[PDB]
Amino acid sequence: SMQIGMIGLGRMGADMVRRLRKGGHECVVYDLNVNAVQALEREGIAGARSIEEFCAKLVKPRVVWLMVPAAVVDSMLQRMTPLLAANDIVIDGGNSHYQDDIRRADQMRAQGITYVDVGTSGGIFGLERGYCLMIGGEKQAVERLDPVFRTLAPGIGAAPRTPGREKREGTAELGYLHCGPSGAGHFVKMVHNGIEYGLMAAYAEGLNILHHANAGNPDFYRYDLDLADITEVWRRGSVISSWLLDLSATALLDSPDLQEFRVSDSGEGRWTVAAAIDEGVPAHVLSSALYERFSSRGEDDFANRLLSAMR
Amino acid sequence: SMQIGMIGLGRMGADMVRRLRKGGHECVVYDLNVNAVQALEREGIAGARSIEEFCAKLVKPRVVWLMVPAAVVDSMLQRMTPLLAANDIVIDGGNSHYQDDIRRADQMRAQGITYVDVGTSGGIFGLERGYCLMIGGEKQAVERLDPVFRTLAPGIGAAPRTPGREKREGTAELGYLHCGPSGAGHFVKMVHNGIEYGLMAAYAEGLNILHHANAGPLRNPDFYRYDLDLADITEVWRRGSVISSWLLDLSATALLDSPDLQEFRVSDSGEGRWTVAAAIDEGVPAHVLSSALYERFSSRGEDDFANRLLSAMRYEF
Amino acid sequence: SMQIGMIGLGRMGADMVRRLRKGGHECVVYDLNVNAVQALEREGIAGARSIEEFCAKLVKPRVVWLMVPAAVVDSMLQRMTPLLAANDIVIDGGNSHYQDDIRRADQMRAQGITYVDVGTSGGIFGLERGYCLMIGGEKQAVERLDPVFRTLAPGIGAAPRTPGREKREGTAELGYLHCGPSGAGHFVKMVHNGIEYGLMAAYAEGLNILHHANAGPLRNPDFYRYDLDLADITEVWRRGSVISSWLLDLSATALLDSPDLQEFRVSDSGEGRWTVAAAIDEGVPAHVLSSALYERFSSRGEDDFANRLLSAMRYEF
Amino acid sequence: SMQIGMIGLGRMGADMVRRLRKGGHECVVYDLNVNAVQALEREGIAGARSIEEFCAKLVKPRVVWLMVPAAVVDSMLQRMTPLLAANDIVIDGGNSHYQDDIRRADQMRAQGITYVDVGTSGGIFGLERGYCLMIGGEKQAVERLDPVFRTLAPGIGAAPRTPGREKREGTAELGYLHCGPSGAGHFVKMVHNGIEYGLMAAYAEGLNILHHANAGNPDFYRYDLDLADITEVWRRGSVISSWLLDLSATALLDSPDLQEFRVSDSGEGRWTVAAAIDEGVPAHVLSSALYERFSSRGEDDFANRLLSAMR
Numbered sequence A, D: 001s002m003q004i005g006m007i008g009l010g011r012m013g014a015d016m017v018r019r020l021r022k023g024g025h026e027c028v029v030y031d032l033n034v035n036a037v038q039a040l041e042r043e044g045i046a047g048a049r050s051i052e053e054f055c056a057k058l059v060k061p062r063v064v065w066l067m068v069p070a071a072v073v074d075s076m077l078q079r080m081t082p083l084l085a086a087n088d089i090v091i092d093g094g095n096s097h098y099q100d101d102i103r104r105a106d107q108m109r110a111q112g113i114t115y116v117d118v119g120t121s122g123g124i125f126g127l128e129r130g131y132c133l134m135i136g137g138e139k140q141a142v143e144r145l146d147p148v149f150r151t152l153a154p155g156i157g158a159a160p161r162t163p164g165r166e167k168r169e170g171t172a173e174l175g176y177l178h179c180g181p182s183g184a185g186h187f188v189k190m191v192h193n194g195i196e197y198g199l200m201a202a203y204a205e206g207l208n209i210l211h212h213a214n215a216g217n218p219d220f221y222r223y224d225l226d227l228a229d230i231t232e233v234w235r236r237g238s239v240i241s242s243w244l245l246d247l248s249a250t251a252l253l254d255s256p257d258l259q260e261f262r263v264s265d266s267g268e269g270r271w272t273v274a275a276a277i278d279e280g281v282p283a284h285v286l287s288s289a290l291y292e293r294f295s296s297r298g299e300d301d302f303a304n305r306l307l308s309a310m311r
Numbered sequence B, C: 001s002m003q004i005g006m007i008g009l010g011r012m013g014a015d016m017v018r019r020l021r022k023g024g025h026e027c028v029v030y031d032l033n034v035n036a037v038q039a040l041e042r043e044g045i046a047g048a049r050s051i052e053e054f055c056a057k058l059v060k061p062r063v064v065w066l067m068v069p070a071a072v073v074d075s076m077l078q079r080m081t082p083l084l085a086a087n088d089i090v091i092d093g094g095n096s097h098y099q100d101d102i103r104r105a106d107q108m109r110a111q112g113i114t115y116v117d118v119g120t121s122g123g124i125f126g127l128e129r130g131y132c133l134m135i136g137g138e139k140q141a142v143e144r145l146d147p148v149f150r151t152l153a154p155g156i157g158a159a160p161r162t163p164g165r166e167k168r169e170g171t172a173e174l175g176y177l178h179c180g181p182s183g184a185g186h187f188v189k190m191v192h193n194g195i196e197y198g199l200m201a202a203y204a205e206g207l208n209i210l211h212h213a214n215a216g217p218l219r220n221p222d223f224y225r226y227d228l229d230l231a232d233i234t235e236v237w238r239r240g241s242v243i244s245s246w247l248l249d250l251s252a253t254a255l256l257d258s259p260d261l262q263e264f265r266v267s268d269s270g271e272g273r274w275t276v277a278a279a280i281d282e283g284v285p286a287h288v289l290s291s292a293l294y295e296r297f298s299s300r301g302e303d304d305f306a307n308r309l310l311s312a313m314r315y316e317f
Helices: A011-022 A034-041 A051-057 A070-083 A098-109 A123-129 A139-144 A146-152 A184-211 A227-234 A243-254 A268-279 A284-296 A301-310 B011-022 B034-042 B051-057 B070-083 B098-109 B123-129 B139-144 B146-152 B184-211 B230-237 B246-257 B271-282 B287-299 B304-316 C011-022 C034-042 C051-057 C070-083 C098-109 C123-129 C139-144 C146-152 C184-211 C230-237 C246-257 C271-282 C287-299 C304-316 D011-022 D034-041 D051-057 D070-083 D098-109 D123-129 D139-144 D146-152 D184-211 D227-234 D243-254 D268-279 D284-296 D301-310
Strands: A003-007 A026-030 A063-066 A089-092 A114-121 A132-136 A176-180 B003-007 B026-030 B063-066 B089-092 B114-121 B132-136 B176-180 C003-007 C026-030 C063-066 C089-092 C114-121 C132-136 C176-180 D003-007 D026-030 D063-066 D089-092 D114-121 D132-136 D176-180
Touching: A003 A011, A003 A051, A011 A026, A011 A034, A011 A123, A011 A146, A026 A034, A026 A051, A051 A070, A063 A070, A070 A089, A070 A098, A089 A098, A098 A114, A098 A184, A114 A139, A114 A184, A132 A146, A132 A184, A132 B230, A139 A146, A146 A176, A176 A184, A176 B230, A184 A227, A184 A243, A184 A268, A184 A284, A184 B184, A184 B271, A184 B287, A184 C304, A227 A243, A227 B132, A227 B176, A243 C304, A268 A284, A268 B184, A268 D268, A284 B184, A284 B287, A284 C287, A284 C304, A284 D284, A301 C184, A301 C246, A301 C287, B003 B011, B003 B051, B011 B026, B011 B034, B011 B123, B011 B146, B026 B034, B026 B051, B051 B070, B063 B070, B070 B098, B089 B098, B098 B114, B098 B184, B114 B139, B114 B184, B132 B146, B132 B184, B139 B146, B146 B176, B176 B184, B184 B230, B184 B246, B184 B271, B184 B287, B184 D301, B230 B246, B246 D301, B271 B287, B271 C271, B287 C287, B287 D284, B287 D301, B304 D184, B304 D243, B304 D284, C003 C011, C003 C051, C011 C026, C011 C034, C011 C123, C011 C146, C026 C034, C026 C051, C051 C070, C063 C070, C070 C098, C089 C098, C098 C114, C098 C184, C114 C139, C114 C184, C132 C146, C132 C184, C132 D227, C139 C146, C146 C176, C176 C184, C176 D227, C184 C230, C184 C246, C184 C271, C184 C287, C184 D184, C184 D268, C184 D284, C230 C246, C230 D132, C230 D176, C271 C287, C271 D184, C287 D184, C287 D284, D003 D011, D003 D051, D011 D026, D011 D034, D011 D123, D011 D146, D026 D034, D026 D051, D051 D070, D063 D070, D070 D089, D070 D098, D089 D098, D098 D114, D098 D184, D114 D139, D114 D184, D132 D146, D132 D184, D139 D146, D146 D176, D176 D184, D184 D227, D184 D243, D184 D268, D184 D284, D227 D243, D268 D284
Parallel strands: A003 A026, A003 A063, A063 A089, A089 A114, A132 A176, B003 B026, B003 B063, B063 B089, B089 B114, B132 B176, C003 C026, C003 C063, C063 C089, C089 C114, C132 C176, D003 D026, D003 D063, D063 D089, D089 D114, D132 D176
Antiparallel strands: A114 A132, B114 B132, C114 C132, D114 D132
């Protein structure tokens, strides 16, 4: 059992505070936005009206968790570090690029503060089922953080054991993993999202082929397929069953033609392709998934006009 | 409870018979390869030494399941159809292209025989876990076949129910589905395989990026000095991440067994190609399905000539 | 100097007749649409008001060129073949799929008629500049046709000679080529079009990147504040760069005329699809040809359903 | 007529000095490598044995052209700037990324020195036919540089005029172009190369389909095509005629099976895709061209083994 300060009280920050506390830890929360801080006080969680009070309320060695917008992080660290102390641990659990972690961890180390990066997967489902956690930073900090990660993670019961897993040690089976030195956590999280784009694109394209199976040799394209039912049937016994398939089946059940649904993207997909390119790794599928999101917003438009022009 | 004849006694055919039997049905089997029939006979399943005895042993109306190579199907139909009778049902459960089911179904119907296409997924795991079944053909025949599909399929218990399914009926929740008229089962199974290629390619490419995270051209080598444990990472993704799936479970198992996969050219069996062909005909964008297929092609060196041409152009300019 | 009958009097057919005539050949033309024949008759080219008079007017052995829609070809052959004679030659110069040339060539040969496929490139520019011609079919017929191809093609003068060509003969340097037996001309023209899609997509995507260079997510907006002049840039690339080409010349002309292309959904006519189908059958990786095709599909919104599904998944998780 | 210092005497640097001088300009050359400097002295071109002498020999306002490896540029500028003077112009004609130009131009401006970026196209052919030039930087510098660019560029005679080009002014028709402020030159050069990859990939894939047209319904794939002849025929009257096609036809003439030819890549292709991703522009074709080069070196290998594994 530990005391954890949380800065950044959006949905994720607030949900992680709820899970941590429900798991027996003590939380102090802070946010530039007083209504946000006050929402959590209404739930019995200690607040703080400034970064000075927040640091005052946390006993040394401190553990500070950040769930703020990426572009807010450096300013956050600047405002706070002068009240922090050697042996403190600061964790950035947000959507920061791993090269920023490497620089940040360096600056904090110059003041005896250990900076830990955490890539978080699970979104709104994490509250009850736990979050998948990809952790970068110094071993000592990460080991001291163990009780926090155990509460946050799903625990081994979240899935059948992999045959032979008893041959290995570490925490991989619990749903959280120390991936490496500073940055490694966000680096693995980035690629996670890149892969996620690819998986979604593969289902999407495939179902689009089914959706057009009535295009009608028109005689070979006169199928009126039931996509809701087809995705449902794939959940059992097929090679392509997955959480993403489960979600597709749910949506399609509600709305067989998705008529109440332009796809945005948040960065990790983009950063994944950039890392592929730096490393010289072929990334056709991951990049095309990304580009499909761009074109879905009409960013292909000017290329299309030139095509019409030439022709 | 039913009598089912099974032709084609390779791993898949043998396994469905074992599952069929174990689930209370009566099977008679046959294969051009006698060693194969005998092996099932040793298991105490009724055999047959010729197409003739096979048809003879099946009481009318017959139910005949084919698990032969795609290339052997038409000649299996030429050979046995003269012994079959109106109201018999023939099922092709192998990897046939749906356009062939359409033609075949028409031929057989002219003889009062109902031709049913089944795309089956699940492979070696189907014996114990049930096969996902995608079924095309006439409604009457598919309804007659319901007990065989129920036995073969996983059953609702195999996965938690989709919020709202109590609002719907049909068999989808059991792991089998009548997809449409003739060809529809193989059409849907084809796309399932195309999707499967795309899914495997996404994992593979991403894991390849992680694998190269120690690459440290290269502007900041310090940004690429991670020695990542791919076995652990795939394991950790199985709980709480957006990308858990059966394919991940398999990747984790393979990487646990071989962290460098050093004992391992990727083949492709056709359904991936057929899927892209359907996409092209339909005017459906298929970047990722196609690219996953093409990666298999280049993995066999089929890009070699394009590559030499690029090197040569470079030499030229 | 030869007599050539031409059926199909759209822009392309009319232009080849004009070029043919202007180059000293005798043309007789015909089209199901009388207004079209008359228009050429006004130009003082011999017409015909029926398939019958058409064949009647052509001295045996005949040379008959088709420039009709692909979909009209077989019925044009059914209709006129009973009036034709052994040792006649029929040329299909339109956009037929090569597998159809193979079948058609076989049918016609059974009547002593030689069927020749010509893939023609160059479009509206062919009249003054000559058409690139890719020719499939029997050697004897193609040799008999040499004077017609010479007239139709650009001639060696149209581009500087490739260092070493004096080491080789044949007609390639003239802008026409006997590519192989029946279907080979259309096979090669098909891939030419596939390549053309890839080339246009490369320019378009790159110009789109330049077009967005003022985008200033976005880590350093100062790194994207270029307002680039795409008309000037394409113009400057025409001299001294690695990427000058006819397609660039066209891009430059379009952008000069319309820097924002504001008066401009991309269609595709089939050869691009057929090219990817050939690639798939052959096991050839085709990432860029396919992606250029798929971009045309999504430009028509055919991705819409895949997109809604992604939005919905996002909503779900 | 002007005096131009050249630093970096590889093939391009040396070739540009030959073209400049053949065009009436005066050149002083320098290189860390004395044999390189001496090769050019053997041809009657003034050398310099150090960066101090080089700067000494150049009359103010100076014009310094750099053709050094990208990774050498900043060190070059550091060693040299203390001997330079306000009103001097420094040009980086090499393969530098445009964001470096923006930073560099800033630092040089703080000392009254104008920094010009030039993207050069044409390689070994530029000596005789002139180089295509994409120029970024301050208008005043670029205008003062005009006589140098005119000598280097092909001149309008290199190609038929675009109908209506008389409606516009500027130098685009001469083969060189002021593209914008600092970086714009290298930015346009980068995308040039990205496009080049795409064009080469399109021909390569297409010819590979022809090459496999004898794969044999095997009856539909029994064509033995003559690729040398086919590329030759496409040079006249087709839609796809191009310099790149001209080069393909030459190579194939020599070696119909390319048996005496793993494809490397130099960076601009990579940087092009990164810019696409930052801008949210779909880049399927350009990226796949790049990834084909990566896989041609076997970088796909580990992904392929995993595919075999799962299956």
